């Protein structure tokens, strides 16, 4: 499901992140050798962590927000979020006619736009495959005409099967709440819910 | 008192900051016994050359404490390798490889101002020995944390020659054990399992299985299948009580259900021991003349002082 | 104190830690089934 | 016992042979202590554990506990003594040891030393030859009288098998009816001395009648070779076959576990029949290492027909000293064929070690991230094995099986390390040799692994085949067997795997020890 | 938990603490060498 | 460390925690009075 | 001595020792055999040379005896057991006349 925000529900401008913390969580078997060399082995999967802080929420906005959150807690599905700082539409066009040749594993990826896309995805922008819900981060870009060579920080979780389509816009993190067990909201005498915050965490 | 060179007795007394390195030399676990490869390692930050051997660094992480009491016990030591080398991991986790009797020697080296090894041991004019024994055990501990830093530790286990305290090394009076018989294709052929290569054509214990039954014909109804205990008194310690200790002591054991009574004892000094029959047969035309062979003791003995035919020695008191 | 409950929740570790100091010498705790 | 002691030697006056000679050598014993504890005879005046009734599965030799002894009135030298052999409905008595010499002599060597009938070697003659007079290789008949005269006196047996509805022996009832018993008249008792109430239900026994005379002046110690209690063998289709005793270990354990008369009363409801049936066939796998012709004492090792296969991988002829605890008896029945009673998932599940071509594939990424490897090669890895067993080829004495391995000693730099073993429930020499070889092979894989898996993969039980695949090591579908499994209520399963190999379950070729049997033709006076 | 490693690093103390409660009565752990 | 003193002040708990893992199987510590 | 080879190597070595003292030591590399002895030039340790910790423990009970009784297989007899028993008047003048016997074999 979709986390409410001013893009989906413009009538509630109180929704919307006062501050978002996009943390990098890659567990590693780090070992500090006696000779000064540091050896680290990556085994556990990496996952983005999102910490959302909300401004002063009025009672109706908080009613909508916690209604959506409680529906999340009820039906048990995943909770998608859209970070707005990465919503710079730097790539126009429709990506259905873009083919990613099969048999690709690792950070590097090669995709052929077939002369369809307009706009260059600069480093630091997000990237997501059509099938898998993992969200990557472009670290370097290099194109030779139509073919694009993109390097992603997390290695491709699944090897491309030749049908996965690039998603350069409207990327949603498939996250799970981490504050659900004890989630309280305080109501002031001024009439606003203060200090509403979420500690999300990408699942899979 | 392990004597130390007087030259080292001055350095160990004047200098306060001592730079010490432990030089490890373990034998590689190999599938077969052919050859003898050694991995040389050190705990120091730089490689250390000792007797022309380069003890490479960057693998060993920690070493345990060697403790020795005045009661006989296995001397256990535990040194840990990094476990992320991925070249030491495969040696430990390799399939079809055994390290049952692979040794390890650890030296305690002190570094000088110029970076050399301060001589300590008088006989070698080099560093002391911290531990030398056998590799009995091992393991790796992977700990992958879903958020944070994981660790992996490969720990090698070490001990002295007495690691297997439940080990009975003895020459049981039997042909199959004496010559190390093993089926090779379709026959029981002697192998290298014998304690000596010259034991492969020794048929001394060939008729030991039927000796007791044949001998029993010429004995009393009692003592038909019996033998005196080789050791009567064994030692009263805190592991026993007076009643239990003096009740456990036995005089004679039945040979039809006591396979521990057919082991060959070893005697130092003048002691009385029973004889285990290994052959018994009569003459053809004189059936009342019976030859019976008793195996007394083990190894090159000085000789037999006296023989007790029954309970009366041939040489009277 | 409340240490009894805890130890009762980690008994096997105690058994192993005991049997690890008896194996220093030739003693072991698997010699109680006879008696 | 006191009445019987009058007609015995000064020695063996109050004595009885131990029901179980060898019981099992494990890490709870040492060689010296284990082989010193084994006893041959026990005094009946201060050992109340010697008056318990044993239960026998398969062909085994057991002593007889007297329960009655009295002479005739006008013929005081004719004494009736009743010995209770074994428990439950037994197939029958194979042979009777009047003293230390069986009525059916071993072979040609034992025939020329005394008056005997038939041969136990090759021919496999049984006691029923005494009544039939022909070559018979099947057990006695319930309530039939047998006459045995070796030239020193007449002996009559009247074998009785166990049955739920035994009737009182007619011979003793007839003697007691006419006031024929000597102490019956001494104490003034009437026909109630022995009546129809003396049913002796669910207990096999024999009423051996002695004619003490100029030659047999003493009553010798009586022992017998029973064929064992009949067990229920469950078939896959659904039919139930309980007509003969079975050498399969699982059926013997199932009989011991579902009996409220002796042992624990575990109802057949608390048992998955299909799993037990499938696991029995694992112990029923035919071994091809040796030949059926190589065992001349075929009748007295549990087999019934030399023509048939009778080459199961594990065959057990067991004696259960009922004076032991139920827990220890079950623990002793197991460890003779592997086995692990499991109470997980509700029922009682019997699992034995086996190799599978379709194990469950666990990758390390499916675990919880923890992993503990531990290989204790010291104290657990051996290069040679030495075992012992009670072999009916000898006069039920102990035979040692010893062999080395040149490959395992080429490895380990020629170190001498011997595995010491002792089989209590195995009597076939070739089966014991195969089991010792299996244990020696299994000792070379001493390396265990522990990790946790999520709620999925629920259903893992001990002795299950699992293929581990951890790419960081050189492991791709490594064979493991479950050793410890722990289920939590929050859906986490803790496992401890044990490394095995394929070679553990292949059988190496062996030779025949048929010519190395040592019958005890001693303990009797040779004729002129 | 991680208590097993610790106990494995202090085994002798466990042995002594055990033998100190068995000496209350006449039992002691030095009676295992016989078996 | 200073763990020895503590364990020496809680010996009976150690004994019980040990005997609770031996009772899993048929072993128990009350079988030492014989020896 | 008679060494019943059916025993374990560990127990056989442990039995050979404790007959003359002895302590097999694997420290400093080699196997060293040390027996109890008195020396006129021992190594002098002052407490200021230590790390500051010190534990004194004297278990006079269960370890202090006033008389000894031993047994042995003596060839003077027909290899039977002979008992050696003697008391000490000084050790019983101490300890307030308590009767405590050391049992040995």
Cα–Cα distance list, D246 to D138, D228, D229, D284, D305 (Å): 15, 9, 9, 11, 14
What SS3 state is found at D32? helix
Please state whether beta strands B290-295 and D16-17 pair in parallel, antiparallel, or not at all (unpaired). unpaired
Strand order in the sheet with D397-404: D397-404, D384-391, D418-420
Task: Return the residue matching tokens 């197939």.
Answer: D91
- C-alpha to C-alpha distance for D460 and D455, rounded to whole angstroms: 11
User: How far, in Å, CA of B65 to CA of B63, rounded?
Assistant: 7
Residue D347 and residue D267: Cα distance in Å, rounded?
A: 11
H or E, element range at A142 = strand A135-144
Distance of alpha carbon B286 from its chain centroid, rounded? 49
Give the whole-angstrom CA distance, residue B309 versus residue B311.
6
Distance CA D391, CA D297 (A): 10
Contacts with D472 from chain A: Cβ below 8 Å: 41, 43
For residue D233, the surrounding DSSP H or E stretch is: strand D233-234
Instruction: Name chain C contacts of B71, Cβ cutoff 8 Å.
Output: 25
Is residue F9 helix, strand or coil? coil
Q: What chain C residue is nearest to G8 in terms of C-alpha separation?
A: C26
In the structure encoding, which two tokens stand for residue D225, read together? Answer: 């070779």
Both tokens assigned to A83: 């970070």
Q: Which residues on C lie below 8 Å from G15 (Cβ)?
A: none
A44: contact with B, CB 8 A cutoff: yes
- Token pair, residue A139, equals 């670290």
In whole angstroms, give the CA distance from residue G57 to residue E32.
25
Give φ, ψ of F11 to 5 degrees: -65, -45
Residue D252 per-residue DSSP state: H
C-alpha R_g of chain D = 26
Calculate the alpha carbon distances from B216 to A153, B224, B264, B287, D221 in Å: 87, 5, 21, 15, 19
Closest CA to B38 of A38, B51, B111: B51
- Structure token digits, residue D70: 């009295």
CA angle, residues D118, D120, D124, in degrees to nearest 5: 95
The dihedrals phi and psi of A29, each to the nearest 5 degrees, come to -90, 85
Decide: D504 and D442 in contact? Cβ < 8 Å: yes
Of B239, B244, B248, the CB nearest to E33: B239
Beta-carbon count within 10 A of B303 CB: 4
The closest of A99, A150, A105, A104 to A124, measured between CA atoms, is: A150
Give me the residues of F, 6-35, that contact D with CB < 8 A.
25-26
Distances, alpha carbon B133 to alpha carbons B71, B130, C25, D163, G22, in Å: 18, 10, 17, 64, 20
Q: Which tokens sit at E18?
A: 């055990």
The sign one gets for the Cα dihedral E22, E23, E29, E34 is negative
Which residues from F are below 8 Å from E11, CB to CB? none
**Cβ-contact B267, B297 below 8 angstroms:** yes
CA distances for D497 relative to A92, D221, D372, D493, angstroms: 55, 51, 10, 13
At D16, phi and psi to the nearest 5? -155, 140
**DSSP 8-state symbol, D254:** H
Cβ contacts of D219 within 8 Å, gap of 6 or more = D4, D7, D8, D79, D81, D210, D212
Contact residues of D toward A, CB < 8 A: 364, 369, 472
E-contacting chains (≥3 CB pairs under 8 Å):
B, C, D, F
CB of D474 closer than 8 Å to CB of D358: no
The residue count for chain D: 528
CB-CB contact of D311 with D301 (8 Å)? no
Can you read off the two tokens belonging to residue D298?
């075929």
Contacts of G64 (CB under 8 A, 6+ apart): G95, G100
Question: What's the reported resolution, in angstroms, to a tenth?
Answer: 3.9
Residue G65 exposed, middle or buried by CB count within 10 Å (0-12, 13-18, 19+):
middle
Nearest to D95 by CA among D219, D223, D202, D208: D223
D86: Cα within 13 Å, side-chain hemisphere: 31
Strands A47-53 and A197-202: antiparallel
Whether D438 and D445 have beta carbons less than 8 Å apart is answered as no
Residues 6 or more apart whose CB falls under 8 angstroms from that of D46 comprise none
Please indicate whether, in this complex, the C-beta atoms of E28 and F33 are within 8 angstroms of each other. no
d(CA B145, CA B142): 10
User: Are B213 and B239 contacting, i.e. CB atoms less than 8 angstroms apart?
Assistant: no
* C-to-D residue pairs, Cβ atoms closer than 8 angstroms: 15
Residues near C26 by beta carbon (within 8 Å), at least 6 away in sequence:
B72, B165, B166, E33, G8, G10, G11, G14
DSSP per-residue string spanning C1-35: -THHHHHHTSHHHHHHHHHHHHTTTT--GGGSS--
Q: How was this structure determined?
A: cryo-EM
Distance, first Cα to last Cα, chain C: 33
Q: What is the distance between the alpha carbons of residues B226 and B197, in angstroms, rounded to a whole number?
A: 34
Cβ pair E29:C27 closer than 8 A: yes
* Strand-pair partners of B237: none
CB D429 within 8 A of CB D393: yes
Provide the shortest C-alpha distance from residue G96 to chain B (in Å): 26
Task: Give chain B positions within 8 Å (CB) of F35.
Answer: 239-241, 244
- G abuts A (3+ Cβ pairs < 8 Å): no
How far does Cα D83 stand from its chain's mean position? Answer: 21
Residue at token pair 């004496």: B178
**Could you give the C-alpha distances from D169 to D145, D157, D205, D210, in angstroms and in order?**
11, 12, 11, 17
Pairwise CA distance, residues B43 & B64, whole Å: 13
- Smallest CA-to-CA distance from E32 within D33, B275, B246 is with D33
Greatest pairwise CA separation for chain D in angstroms = 91
In Å, how far is G27's CA from the nearest CA of chain C?
15
Q: Give F-chain residues touching B239 at CB under 8 angstroms.
A: 35
Name the nearest CA neighbour of E29 among C18, A144, D278. Answer: C18
- Judged by DSSP in three states, D141 sits in coil
3-state secondary structure of D281: helix
B303, HSE (Cβ side, Cα atoms, 13 Å): 2
Residue B175 burial (CB count, 10 A): 18
Query: How far is Cα B8 from Cα B126, in angstroms, rounded to an integer?
Result: 10
Find, among B97, A50, B113, A37, the residue nearest to D499 by Cα: B97
Q: In whole angstroms, what separates CA A51 from the centre of its chain?
A: 12
**Closest C-alpha among A186, A99, A173 to residue A135:** A173
Structure tokens that stand for F20 in this block: 């609770």
Q: Reduce the secondary structure of D464-492 to three states and give it as a string.
A: CEEEEECCCCCCCCEEEEEEEEEECCCCC
C-alpha distance across the termini of chain D, in Å: 36
Give the position of tokens 């030393």. Answer: D113
Longest dimension (CA), chain C: 35
Task: Report whether D415 contacts D382 (CB < 8 A).
Answer: no
DSSP secondary structure code for residue G77 in this structure = T
Cα–Cα separations (whole angstroms), residue D283 to D238, D243, D316 = 20, 20, 10
Ramachandran angles phi, psi of D109, nearest 5°: -65, -40
Q: Please, which residues bridge with residue D205 across strands?
A: D84, D160
The number of beta carbons lying within 10 Å of the beta carbon of residue B94 is 15
- DSSP character string of chain B: -----HHHHHHHHH-SS-EEEEEEEEE--BSSSSS--EEEEESSSS-EEETTEEEB-SSEEEE------SS-----EEEEE-S-SSSHHHHHH-TT-B-TT-EEEEEEEEE-SSS-BPP-BTTTTBPEEEEEEEE---EEEEE--SSSEEEEEEEEEEE-TT--SS-----BS-HHHHTTEEESSSSEEE-TTSSSGGGGG--TTTTHHHHHHHHHTTS-STTTT-EE-S-S-----TTS-HHHHHHH--SEE-TTS-GGGGBPPEE-SS-----EEEEEEE-SS-TT-EEEEEE-SSSS-------BSSSSBSS--
Tokens of D360: 């469950």
- Which residues, 6 or more positions from B143, have their beta carbon under 8 angstroms from its beta carbon? A29, B150, B151, B152, D369, D370, D371
CA end-to-end distance (rounded Å), chain F: 33
- The gap from C-alpha C20 to its chain's centroid, in whole angstroms, comes to 8
Contact at 8 Å (CB) between B125 and B119?
yes
Q: Flag whether A touches F (3+ CB pairs, 8 A cutoff).
A: no
List residues bridging with A138 in a β-sheet: A152
Contacts with G8 from chain C: Cβ below 8 Å = 26
Q: How far is residue D248 CA from its own chain's centroid?
A: 10
Q: Do B72 and C25 touch (CB under 8 A)?
A: yes
């Amino acid at each position: 499901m979709r986390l409410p925000d001013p893009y989906t529900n413009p009538e509630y401008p109180g929704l919307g992140f006062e501050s978002v913390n996009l943390v990098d969580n890659d567990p590693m078997i780090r070992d500090e050798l006696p000779n000064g060399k540091v050896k680290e082995v990556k085994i556990s999967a990496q996952y983005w962590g999102i910490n959302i802080s909300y401004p002063e929420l009025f009672p109706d906005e908080y009613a909508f927000l916690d209604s959506r959150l409680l529906e999340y807690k009820r039906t048990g599905d995943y909770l998608d979020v859209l970070l707005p700082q990465y919503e710079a539409f730097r790539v126009r066009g429709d990506t259905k006619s873009v083919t990613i040749p099969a048999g690709q594993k690792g950070s590097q990826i090669i995709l052929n736009t077939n002369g369809t896309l307009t706009g260059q995805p600069k480093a630091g922008d997000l990237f997501k495959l059509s099938t898998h819900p993992k969200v990557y981060k472009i670290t370097n870009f290099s194109s030779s005409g139509n073919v694009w060579n993109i390097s992603l920080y997390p290695d491709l979780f699944i090897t491309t099967t030749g049908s996965e389509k690039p998603v350069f816009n409207g990327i949603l993190f498939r996250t799970k709440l981490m504050n659900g067990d004890s989630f309280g909201s305080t109501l002031n005498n001024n009439g606003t819910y203060s200090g509403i915050s979420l500690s999300l965490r990408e699942s899979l | 008192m392990k004597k130390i060179l007087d030259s080292a007795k001055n350095y160990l007394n004047t200098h306060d900051k001592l730079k010490t390195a432990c030089l490890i030399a373990l034998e590689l676990p190999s599938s077969s016994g052919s050859a003898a490869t050694y991995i040389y390692l050190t705990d120091y930050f730089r490689d250390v050359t000792y007797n022309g051997i380069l003890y490479r660094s960057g693998k060993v992480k920690s070493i345990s404490s060697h403790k020795q009491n005045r009661q006989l016990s296995i001397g256990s030591l535990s040194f840990t390798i990094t476990g992320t080398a991925e070249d030491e991991v495969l040696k430990l986790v390799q399939n079809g490889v055994s390290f049952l009797d692979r040794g390890i020697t650890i030296h305690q080296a002190i570094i000088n101002e110029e970076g050399n090894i301060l001589p300590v041991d008088p006989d070698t004019d080099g560093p002391l020995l911290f531990f030398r024994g056998r590799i009995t055990g091992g393991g790796i501990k992977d700990n992958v944390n879903t958020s944070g830093i994981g660790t992996s530790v490969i720990t090698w286990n070490c001990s002295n020659q007495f690691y297997d305290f439940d080990r009975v090394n003895g020459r049981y009076t039997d042909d199959a054990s004496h010559r190390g018989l093993e089926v090779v294709n379709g026959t029981l052929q002697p192998s290298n399992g014998a304690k000596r290569p010259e034991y492969q054509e020794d048929y001394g214990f060939f008729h030991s299985n039927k000796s007791t039954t044949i001998l029993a014909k010429y004995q009393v109804k009692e003592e038909r299948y019996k033998l005196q205990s080789k050791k009567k008194l064994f030692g009263l310690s805190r592991s026993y009580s007076l009643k239990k200790y003096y009740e456990t002591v036995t005089k004679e054991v039945d040979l039809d259900f006591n396979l521990a009574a057919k082991f060959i004892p070893v005697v130092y000094g003048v002691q009385k021991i029973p004889g285990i029959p290994i052959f018994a047969d009569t003459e053809l035309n004189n059936p009342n003349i019976v030859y019976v062979v008793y195996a007394f003791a083990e190894g090159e003995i000085d000789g037999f002082l006296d023989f007790y035919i029954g309970d009366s020695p041939m040489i009277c008191f | 104190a409340s240490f009894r409950d805890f130890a009762s929740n980690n008994s096997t570790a105690f058994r192993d830690a005991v049997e690890l100091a008896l194996n220093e010498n030739g003693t072991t705790l698997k010699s109680l089934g006879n008696s | 016992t006191t009445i019987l002691a009058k007609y015995q030697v000064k020695e063996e006056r109050y004595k009885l042979q131990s029901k179980k000679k060898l019981f099992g050598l494990s890490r709870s014993y040492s060689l010296k202590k284990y082989y010193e504890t084994v006893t041959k005879e026990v005094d009946l005046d201060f050992n109340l554990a010697a008056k318990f009734i044993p239960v026998v599965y398969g062909v085994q030799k057991i002593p007889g506990i007297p329960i009655f002894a009295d002479t005739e009135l006008n013929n005081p030298n004719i004494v009736y003594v009743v010995y209770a052999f074994a428990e439950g409905e037994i197939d029958g008595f194979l042979d009777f040891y009047i003293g230390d010499s069986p009525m059916i002599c071993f072979d040609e060597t034992d025939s020329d030393t005394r008056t005997c009938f038939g041969r136990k070697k090759i021919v496999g003659d049984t006691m029923h030859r005494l009544a039939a007079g022909t070559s018979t290789s099947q057990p006695s008949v319930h309530g039939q009288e047998y006459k045995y005269n070796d030239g020193n006196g007449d002996i009559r047996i009247w074998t009785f098998h166990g049955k739920p509805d035994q009737t009182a022996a007619q011979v003793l009832v007839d003697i007691a009816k006419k006031k024929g018993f000597y102490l019956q008249n001494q104490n003034g008792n009437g026909p109630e001395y022995w009546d129809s109430r003396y049913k002796l239900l669910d207990t096999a026994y024999a009423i051996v009648r002695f004619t003490i005379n100029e030659n047999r002046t003493e009553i010798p110690e009586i022992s017998a070779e029973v064929q064992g209690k009949k067990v229920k063998v469950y078939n896959s289709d659904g039919t139930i076959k309980a007509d003969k005793t079975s050498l399969n270990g699982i059926w013997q354990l199932m009989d011991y576990l579902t009996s409220d008369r002796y042992g624990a009363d575990i109802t057949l409801d608390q048992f998955p029949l299909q799993k037990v049936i499938s696991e029995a066939k694992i112990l029923d796998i035919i071994d091809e290492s040796y030949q059926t012709s190589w065992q001349p004492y075929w009748r007295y090792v549990g087999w019934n027909d030399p023509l048939s296969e009778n080459r199961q991988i594990v065959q057990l002829n067991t004696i259960l000293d009922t004076s032991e605890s139920v827990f220890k008896n079950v623990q002793g029945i197991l460890e003779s064929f592997g086995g692990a009673i499991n109470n997980l998932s509700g029922e009682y599940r019997i699992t034995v070690e086996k190799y599978s071509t379709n194990p469950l594939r666990i990758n390390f990424l499916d675990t919880y991230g923890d992993l503990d490897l531990s290989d204790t090669t010291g104290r657990n890895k051996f290069n040679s094995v030495q075992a012992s067993l009670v072999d009916p080829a000898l006069s039920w004495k102990t035979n040692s099986i010893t062999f080395y391995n040149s490959k395992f000693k080429e490895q380990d730099k020629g170190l001498d390390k011997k595995l010491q073993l002792s089989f209590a429930n195995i009597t076939n020499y070739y089966t014991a040799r195969s089991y010792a070889d299996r244990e020696l092979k299994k000792s070379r894989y001493s390396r265990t692994l522990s990790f946790s898996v999520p709620y999925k993969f629920i259903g893992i039980e001990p002795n299950d085949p699992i293929a581990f695949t951890y790419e960081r090591y050189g492991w791709k579908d490594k064979f493991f067997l479950v050793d410890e499994v722990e289920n939590t209520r929050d859906g986490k399963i803790n496992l401890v795997l044990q490394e095995y190999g394929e070679d553990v379950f292949i059988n190496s070729e062996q030779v025949d020890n048929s010519g190395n049997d040592i019958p005890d033709i001693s303990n009797n006076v040779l004729p002129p």
